[PDB]
Design a protein around this ligand. Sequence first.
Ligand code: ALX
Length: 490
Amino acid sequence: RRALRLGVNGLPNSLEPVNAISNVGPRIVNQIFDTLIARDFFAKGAPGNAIDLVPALAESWERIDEKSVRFKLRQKVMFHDGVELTADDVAYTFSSERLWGPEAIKKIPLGKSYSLDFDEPVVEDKYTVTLRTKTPSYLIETFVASWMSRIVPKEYYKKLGAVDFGNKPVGTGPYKFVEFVAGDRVVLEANDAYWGPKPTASKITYQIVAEPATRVAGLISGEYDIITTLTPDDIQLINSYPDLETRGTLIENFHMFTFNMNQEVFKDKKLRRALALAVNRPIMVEALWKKQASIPAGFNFPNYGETFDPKRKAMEYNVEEAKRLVKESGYDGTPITYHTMGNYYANAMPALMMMIEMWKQIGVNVVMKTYAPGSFPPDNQTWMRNWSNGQWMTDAYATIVPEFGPNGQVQKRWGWKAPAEFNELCQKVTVLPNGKERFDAYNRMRDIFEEEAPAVILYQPYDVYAARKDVHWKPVSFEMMEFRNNLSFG
Ligand SMILES: O=P(O)(O)O[C@@H]1[C@@H](O)[C@H](O)[C@@H](CO)O[C@@H]1O
């Protein structure tokens, strides 16, 4: 078997699966671990975007009532160290201790905020576990198929602790941990004792190549088999090589910019809204994305299913109103920093430079401030920054509630003083089953989100990879790389 060499935009600071949640962690942690339920992106000849859910670590499951789901586990699955997976490991994964309780916040900072209102799991037998919520939740199934739900080994994880575990992970996945050189590379090797499809690569390397031009040259020189996070501008040249090709797809994520609302200039919604109203998304999508990116109608995406609003109007663009808001605001002309980690996000700097021009036309002076990985300054030294949100559930709950909700980081850390009505609606949508009331509540939340502008949605990126034609692998419609029944050579 051939070793797979990947040229990547960045790496997570931990391989602990919840802590690894980002654009860069899942492509690694998806290899090391498994979930109870998994998504088959290639079902019924779909081009890596199928919504179909299939058994994975759980052979079957059944919803018992409004707050519990019973899982029948696959038997004789082994973790990479030979330990057998049991309901004990699954209960530990979803426990107060490890994940959502007061004692978990120090280890998994976003565990509680991103989790459901969990009750302790119930182990019925070695291969049967019930996952429950304290209050009604119809989101258990989608949560369990998500990146929040990779199953960790209880004894090994408790032995090392979440920090050391993140540096030496043990999972049930098709690839096992070899090395992690902080801010440089991750090496994984084939897990030949895997319960599912046998791994097709002997090894996988994720080498950070921060600069996309250098990443592109690395594939050209034969240093890499697949490279990530390219832009539509790289397409024509890469495809000019008979041996190389680009592979891309729209993904279930949106790029955005957001604010440090603890800062005086951003405490009020006025300048936040003025900056949002001056963002000409069609020109950015045309110029930087070659029309391949998509512009959603608010915090509203098709993967939400029953809570997607297909009749929703496009987000407003109004330069004259934006000019009036700047004039009425307390803004003096003082430069406002916008923190970006080079091109961690595809088109980060070209998108920012276009917006700086749009903002200059409305009377706002925005200045780019570059930071290297691990050098994001203290919160109070930041004003604007770019970010992204992966839409990780088959429901509108994510990411508006975990990120922007009353218990979330945009309010708690970043100082968004959300209107009381917004927080009231977040609590309602959490417990309600699908219906008119829940549907309408999400629309009112979308309306408040656009009015308040705690963040400004740019677009869904067209995720561009490039690969050698002799490396058969298809991208999926999510911020990760799938190799199960999707990697072969020659
Ligand atoms: O944009 P990033 O690469 O920094 O990572 C974000 C997370 O921070 C976020 O938790 C998640 C869900 O909304 O979406 C992304 O994965």
